[PDB]
């Protein structure tokens, strides 16, 4: 069931599209989670917003200039906070001669230009903006309210964690990047490209994540000694040629305006924006995530990193194991090939 662990693309009907959690269970019944990343192209008739003409006054409170240092396929990204600017001011800079997308024919050409030029002319990424560009009445795949079990955090505790159980906007320009990472608490993520130029992704199958971490630790031994989970700093960029050279399995995919990407628990991903664009993103969960949450290796070395109490999830969904888990004796081993329990419906 997706034995190659290749990135799968799905074209649901509007009927299939409507129930989000159900459709995630479906794509997992097809083995989509084995890749760490999947694409969902929604039905043509669906639109989350009638128009994006009114957003030029939207404020980007903390845009980040992305300074990259390194060579030979191994880089560290330093994200320097600049002054607030509007989307108008951002788009002006993004499309200017200095920062705009270079000319190219085949995608492999743009990809080579990215890996050649990423340490020059540091771009600005309008990242981590609190908000949603969805209209209030849109009930399908609304990143503001997906209605997954991740809602148990706020429902039970009152805790909101911005970007995790609330939506983030991302305004991109050419050569803006996201470093190799898995999600906070090894959650799933959803990413919708609202408009603009493509976003390109790389992914490592969850079943090979440990191999990527071992490799990264060798390449950056200083960082690893100061923090087990140093990839969670989201500063480490590693080219596909380096992955290939050290036998790390991976796949690539380009997301266009109007498409969704789903990332799966413990699926390492990285990528870059092609040009001026806007994405919306949040985290979510399924029952399969709970074991991943229980075993997530978290960053210790930074203050107020994202840590979600697993107690409510184990009690509700794993009552047989609760005492064992609380006694530190729950030695469950994760099988990354298995789909979430809710996929039973589609496998019967």
């Amino acid at each position: 069931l997706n034995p190659s662990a290749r990135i799968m693309t799905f074209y649901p009907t509007m009927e299939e599209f409507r129930n989000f959690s159900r459709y995630i269970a479906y794509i997992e019944s097809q083995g989509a989670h084995r890749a760490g990343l999947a694409k969902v192209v929604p039905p043509k008739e669906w639109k989350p917003r009638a128009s994006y003409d009114d957003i030029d006054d939207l404020v980007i409170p903390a845009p980040i200039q992305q300074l990259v240092t390194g060579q030979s396929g191994l880089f560290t990204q330093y994200n320097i906070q600049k002054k607030a600017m509007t989307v108008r001011e951002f788009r002006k800079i993004a499309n200017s001669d200095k920062y705009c997308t270079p000319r190219y024919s085949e995608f492999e050409e743009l990809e080579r230009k990215y890996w050649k030029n990423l340490t020059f002319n540091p771009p600005i990424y309008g990242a981590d903006v609190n908000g949603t560009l969805y209209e209030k009445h849109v009930d399908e795949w609304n990143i503001g309210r997906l209605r997954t079990i991740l809602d148990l955090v706020e429902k039970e505790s009152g805790i909101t964690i911005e970007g995790v159980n609330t939506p983030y906007l991302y305004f991109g320009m050419w050569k803006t990047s996201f470093a190799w990472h898995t999600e906070d608490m090894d959650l799933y993520s959803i990413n919708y490209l609202h408009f603009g130029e493509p976003k390109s992704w790389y992914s490592v199958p969850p079943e090979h994540g440990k191999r990527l971490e071992r490799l990264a630790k060798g390449f950056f031994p200083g960082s690893a000694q100061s923090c087990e989970a140093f990839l969670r700093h989201k500063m480490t960029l590693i080219s596909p040629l380096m992955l290939k050279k050290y036998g790390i399995p991976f796949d690539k995919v380009t997301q266009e305006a109007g498409e969704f990407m789903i990332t799966f628990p413990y699926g390492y991903h990285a990528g870059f924006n092609h040009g001026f664009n806007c994405a919306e993103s949040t985290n979510f969960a399924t029952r399969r995530w709970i074991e991943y949450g229980k075993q997530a290796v978290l960053c210790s070395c930074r203050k107020d990193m994202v840590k979600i109490s697993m107690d409510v999830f184990v009690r509700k969904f794993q009552p047989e194991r609760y005492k064992l888990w609380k006694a530190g004796k729950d030695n469950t081993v994760i099988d990354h090939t298995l789909p979430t329990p809710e996929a039973a419906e589609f496998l019967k």
Partner: peptide
């Protein structure tokens, strides 16, 4: 805590 795109 909040999600963050990266550090320095």
């Amino acid at each position: 805590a909040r999600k963050s795109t990266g550090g320095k």
